[PDB]
Design a protein around this ligand. Sequence first.
Ligand SMILES: Cc1c[nH]c(=O)[nH]c1=O
Ligand code: SF4
Ligand code: SF4
Lengths: 1010, 1012
Amino acid sequence: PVLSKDVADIESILALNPRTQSHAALHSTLAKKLDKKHWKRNPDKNCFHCEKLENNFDDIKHTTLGERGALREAMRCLKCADAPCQKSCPTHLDIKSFITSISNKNYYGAAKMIFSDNPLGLTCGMVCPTSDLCVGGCNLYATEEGSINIGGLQQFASEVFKAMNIPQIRNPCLPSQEKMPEAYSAKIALLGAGPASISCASFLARLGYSDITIFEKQEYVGGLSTSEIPQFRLPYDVVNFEIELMKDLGVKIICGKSLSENEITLNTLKEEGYKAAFIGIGLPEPKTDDIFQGLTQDQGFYTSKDFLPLVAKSSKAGMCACHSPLPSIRGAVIVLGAGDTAFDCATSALRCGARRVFLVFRKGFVNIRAVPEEVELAKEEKCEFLPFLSPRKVIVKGGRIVAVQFVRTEQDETGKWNEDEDQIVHLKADVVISAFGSVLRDPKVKEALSPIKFNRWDLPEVDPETMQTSEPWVFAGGDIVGMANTTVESVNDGKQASWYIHKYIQAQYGASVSAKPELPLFYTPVDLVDISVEMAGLKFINPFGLASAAPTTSSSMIRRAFEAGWGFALTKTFSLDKDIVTNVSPRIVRGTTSGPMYGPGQSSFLNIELISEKTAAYWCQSVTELKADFPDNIVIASIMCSYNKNDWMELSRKAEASGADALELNLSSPHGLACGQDPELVRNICRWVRQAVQIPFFAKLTPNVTDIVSIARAAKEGGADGVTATNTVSGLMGLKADGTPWPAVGAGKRTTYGGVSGTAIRPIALRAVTTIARALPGFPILATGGIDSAESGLQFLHSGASVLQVCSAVQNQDFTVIQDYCTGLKALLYLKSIEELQGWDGQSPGTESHQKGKPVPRIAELMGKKLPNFGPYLEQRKKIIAEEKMRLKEQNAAFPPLERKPFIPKKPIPAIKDVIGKALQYLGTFGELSNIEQVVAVIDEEMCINCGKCYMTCNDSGYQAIQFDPETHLPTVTDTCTGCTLCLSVCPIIDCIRMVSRTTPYEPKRGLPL
Amino acid sequence: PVLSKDVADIESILALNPRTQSHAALHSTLAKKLDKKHWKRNPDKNCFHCEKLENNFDDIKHTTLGERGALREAMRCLKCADAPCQKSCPTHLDIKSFITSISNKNYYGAAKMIFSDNPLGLTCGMVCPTSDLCVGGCNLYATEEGSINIGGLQQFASEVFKAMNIPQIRNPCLPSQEKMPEAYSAKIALLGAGPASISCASFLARLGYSDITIFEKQEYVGGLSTSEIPQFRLPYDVVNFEIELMKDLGVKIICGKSLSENEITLNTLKEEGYKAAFIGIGLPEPKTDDIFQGLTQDQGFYTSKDFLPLVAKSSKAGMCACHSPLPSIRGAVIVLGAGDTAFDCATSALRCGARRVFLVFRKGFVNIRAVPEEVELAKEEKCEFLPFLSPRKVIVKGGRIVAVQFVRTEQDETGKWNEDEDQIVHLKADVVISAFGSVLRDPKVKEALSPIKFNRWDLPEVDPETMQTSEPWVFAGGDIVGMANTTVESVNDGKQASWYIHKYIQAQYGASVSAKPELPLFYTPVDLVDISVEMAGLKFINPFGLASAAPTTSSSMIRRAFEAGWGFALTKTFSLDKDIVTNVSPRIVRGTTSGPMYGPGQSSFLNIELISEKTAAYWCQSVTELKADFPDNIVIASIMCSYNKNDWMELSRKAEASGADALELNLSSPHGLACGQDPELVRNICRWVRQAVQIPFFAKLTPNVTDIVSIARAAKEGGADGVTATNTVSGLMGLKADGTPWPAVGAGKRTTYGGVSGTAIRPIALRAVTTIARALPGFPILATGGIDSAESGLQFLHSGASVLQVCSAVQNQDFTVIQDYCTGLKALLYLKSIEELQGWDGQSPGTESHQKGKPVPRIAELMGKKLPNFGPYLEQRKKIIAEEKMRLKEQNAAFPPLERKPFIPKKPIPAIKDVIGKALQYLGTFGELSNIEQVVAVIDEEMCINCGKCYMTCNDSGYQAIQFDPETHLPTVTDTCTGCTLCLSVCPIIDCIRMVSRTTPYEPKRGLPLAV
Ligand SMILES: Cc1c[nH]c(=O)[nH]c1=O
Ligand code: SF4
Ligand code: SF4
């Protein structure tokens, strides 16, 4: 047969494989119109009717992210200095830091940083109107691809943290409860269990107050987050999670207790001995219109205050166990108002079975004050919008509303809004919902706030800096104060109040507080994990250090690095005065190793830098100063001489006399040209230094060697106490199209070979560390080469390194990445002790079936029926889903536990010393690998996005083993798979393709039998 | 002094540098409300009134891309098989291939593929309502980050090609014009110079027809693209560009000639010997309403057909011989209708000075015709929308409009639309613009189409597959046929018609055509550039070939690669039968070298794969079959033995006997551990093979050696005819958090050291090629290691290699990348002959000041004033720009553009042999680098997006040399800069930072004085 031709059945599998075209393609406009419908993914501008949404409370947020999407978006963020997104966030979240943690896979560190400044971090990630807050300030707005999805990232890290089931702990910087001053046992009352009080109580408990009680009028907690924000934007279990974290600090909540005249008043709290009160009761009553007087729910009239709590009670499992069914709202629905409460009423009405929804507002579209992302949800669900209409009469016939009569409104040219009595609209409707906003009007409630001063709007007056009312022991915040519009601003109000309540209370007990406000951070048992390590007789407080590189150009930067938390630092390599060098410029350039991607996260750098231009005297004095001021931070002096015994002994003695904890010998000196490339040269250098000094020293090995183990062995034979693996990889980063290099020095555009650093050399450095650790068990290794996160650092520890040197990751960012690395490592260690989470990969949950970060409903009639998410298949999916939601109307939904129990560590948290070298057991020669335990690829069709990359890779780089369906664009791996794993490697969807154990007989294809 | 302590002035420059916090931050809600306005970038939802737009015709497209953004978005595209975006494109653009070209920086290749299927490719990139076309089918809709911006990428690549000023050429496959059959001289008439006829005429010219004339009624060309689509969505210079490309093919345009009775008719056309006619006149008349009868423009009434041409003549230089100012549209404007014409009327009325615009339509929001992107332009410019209103009466007082009276509409229970005579609106207005659509009404024009049949819709009937009317010689397409709603569908109508006009004409001359339509592609002189190369006596038709690797697992795969265009291929390395191997699985994994980015563009792979599992008999028979069928494609047999003279001589002789053009010796065999790591072993292996075979052979070198030049030298000394540099780099690609590796093999989850391939190892391979080329001048080198584009291929050729082997870029994609590589290399070479383009870097234009890929205005009052693009500074920028637009109305603004004259090569096009090794002159030792020719960084404040990364990097990795302003977030480089170049290397904006010569003395910072 013709071996080099595909037989017919492979020709058939290859039918959809890309081919070179030699001609333009002919397809009539009519045929194209018909075919368009088959592939359509997005809304059709020509479908006018609502999708069926009755009883469908699935998440409709455009911002929700899965891990794949969050990692992409977090790597996109520029992680800006003095970031305007944080300036534009009411709780001042350090967005740069938490997004850096997500990009580094440290979801715990991101959550800790979110919740440190916002105790409702998850709620706010889901609901913040970010376009009017943090995202409206984002610098990447100035790029075509646009601002960062900050809320979605916040939601994602916070959801992973919620899944970790880790409790909040008492501020570990506090003395124990019995040694707290009496002031902290002051009885504190908060009124209302909404965002403002939850935040205030949280921060007060962080400060150490131990007698905090929130009194809540209703039988549910969470305020509007629970009672009115729809489940399809804010799942109730988020609210319950955040309140659980609060209760970990000891805050008490008492339901069914009202601030009201014959119940709780400021006076009775005072006589009962309460020392401070926070008023966070919001705006409890609807804004009304006299034309609706006497209308009842039975006739079809609701305020938002009637309607949204009814829908919440039906759709939130355990919010209020008592449920009526979804209100019977079939028919045309009129929603009055253009604030964001109106838009939630409209989309909720659709879930009650509304036939059509009209939002009617009395001004124009330009005057809508709802945030665009709220408006877009009602728009895409095909609500109708009627501007310039003010209601006048509700027509009732047969006990039911049948119509509303409006008059047209208009502006003149003084901005006056007029009502034109001769211009009317008679709009038929079965249900009317007024969403004119909320007010405080209950006389018995206001009476209970006596004698605090109220303003013009009958709201309590506060000092906007302190949140104090006219009574110095009574504070107020959130909606009740009429400043905040949002959850995050209400949270911030309680935060702001908490510091001045603390000041007020301490003053009352005769104590002062800091003039600079100091609210504590958020803490969990993860933060107690010990990440110190001992190596070569040295104690490192954590295993992360600055490599000898641009970030250690000056000793003043090492100082700032130690202040930021770095465990150790190398000096820039320095030499004797006779060997002083002079740098050229340009000399450090971005890598081309991952294509024309600019900005954050460069995959490599190339440098043609030399050793330090600063003198040995500068560095030796600097080491003495640094060791004097930072005795617990390890300082390693990096030094270089030529192949000269007196020089190496002189310089190493000088660095030792300066107080360096250890030395690092830079073996890049030219004497095959480098000393580090010759085992005899390295051994001799190491013996010279070993004779000269008593302190530990480490040989820094170059990777540009045939056998790096032979260099490490020679260092160890010469008396080195360990090795640093590795320096940069020799390379040429690239050429412009005219042939000139980059970096190019001088008018001559000259260059020389540089060293490549960063994540592109990580595989080379990992291989070096592992080969050395296996060949020389127990020999200390300092790892360097592409370390940029706690989890990549843990790879090097697992590979045999004891400490972790960093350069490029700081060049890509700044010194504060150390806080990410330390919290990330603590979390990775803590999680190794949790039985319930062993299916995770470090901080990453097991990947569930998902599309656009939202889980695929587990319905029998969707599973395996070959329905991709486009065209007529997508309309069939929607119908199936819609039918299951109708069918679910009739059945009991379970309750979550009254409140969850955290996962308990089942062994002591591993120390760094427990993880070093643990991966070496899996390494071996090729002959130690089983060639009979083979795998094949299998594709989860529910996660596939139909791109055919697996198919193209298997076709032109594999075994032509995948069928790609010409109608559904769904791939199927067949029995000719050889498990090469290329299709998984190129698939855009994490864990859509999985390698599973091959169940069928596996025969190597020999082409022609031997 | 305390050396390790910042002095007060550095502490000051570091004031905004990030620091670890130990406490939560206290900021009042009121203080936050106040500060939010200082940083605000996007629109403020509390603003009910947007800046003056009078006389502002700057581009408002949200999809426009500069090079930085285009490269990022083109890299995001999955470049899908059988792609649904292409299915959803009416012209069937090969979107996968043109976006692949952009991502590889091959903008010529992208434009060629675009214009091959769509002669109005730049117009369409600008105006296609993609959410209802290609982008509506995009698979990345299923991701949170969403669908690809296909139209912007199409626009970007087409704009670059436009800037190259390269002409279209006559289809180079055709015989010379004198040898063309007489049928191709048939007189062809096209009526109307819009998208439909321009397309049809272009494709007919590609087919070889030499006598094509477009008769256009007006004194301007381009149809609605020119007369109505606003300049702030479609610049007229795009239309002029596409028509000049068509004129390159010899198509003739005659303006001021109408299809109409007593002028051009089908009868007069027939009588004058025209053999085919294409009707592309569009819908020339407005759809009218009786309530507007007698209303004239000076009372304030316009149809869209009156108003939009007025704005266009007044905003498009070069359109029209007469210049004119904008219409005087002051006061409140009512636009009637909700198709996209209405939305262009709304936004255009704002450019004319309207105080207020009302879009009033007779159905609801759910019924708006317009694509959402068109609607959003009006919405964001603060137009008001009034639904459910039907006009009933215009109120005229004092001889002009003062109001329009509407009645409310509603849809009855079934679905029919009623009018509520008693529910009225009296809406004050000064100007009314009806946008009810367009029709063909003129009886003089209809009568000139006698006797073709018309349908119910009063429009010419056509076979929708052929575009033929009832008259066999008359075709029609575009708006006139009533199917197309868009520019791209009208272009497609003309493209569809052109094949069947060709069939009809040929048959009239007694000739047949293929039953399979074969429209030619789009060609320029770039396509004639020769990219062949001779090396070691072998002739390569192009320098790109498949490395010995997974893409050459099977010889059937090589066959398909040669069919796709690949110049050469390696067999997977094979051996004698005694040495047969068996692979494990998993064995090839994605790289972690650039982070958790999945899908296209993996920066590396790692493999633990062995040599081929297929027998030497399979491979030798396959080489014979491949060389029999593909004699012009070079086939190199890659072979491996242990260190054994008889084995190497036997295996190389067997491969020679099978007809391999050459051999490649795989030196990975363990005898360091591998043969290729020892010069003496390599020299002996090459000696053995040289004694065994007469064909050329190449030693494949490993980069995992201290000194690769010594191995290369040993191979040369042993008799090798060249070297392949390099194989994969030894590595481990990483572990899971529980410590298990990936790949993980068997129950024990075991692994071994693997080989790293792909762009991550390109610096290593480039070093090896350059260092061998300098040590061994003229010794042939085959490069492998991260080659994934003509641009990167050219780097290796400049570095001394003659041919270019590829693996990982095909693993990342498929075999068709060869077409991108060849057109890319042709364009790179061609552009070296063009003096006018000396300042480009290859295919990249010199970067100019832009924000969001839109050029920043050149206004003295803006530049140097430290106005960044946010907060109150942005507001001041908008007021300055708006005041400058008022001044361009009130001054001498009118000069049509310089008409294009294509750049002419002013030196020979370099051949491959001319560029090989040209970079080597710039390489040397560090001691050859000047230390007086120092540089400093300087920042272009107009391109800065205020992220402060330059500042952070200089602070914590540099010399604390950048001031970062706390109010404007603008950076300034001070004189302490050392030119290290890190700030440029991390800046997200291409060429915002540039390194320039030091003007002041360069003093090395030494910390303490030297002392002796
Ligand atoms: C001195 C020196 C400069 N640059 C590097 O990458 N490594 C070194 O050791
Ligand atoms: S021509 Fe239009 S529809 Fe086709 S790919 Fe380009 S933008 Fe999309
Ligand atoms: S890195 Fe670039 S964009 Fe960012 S502040 Fe510096 S110059 Fe501006």
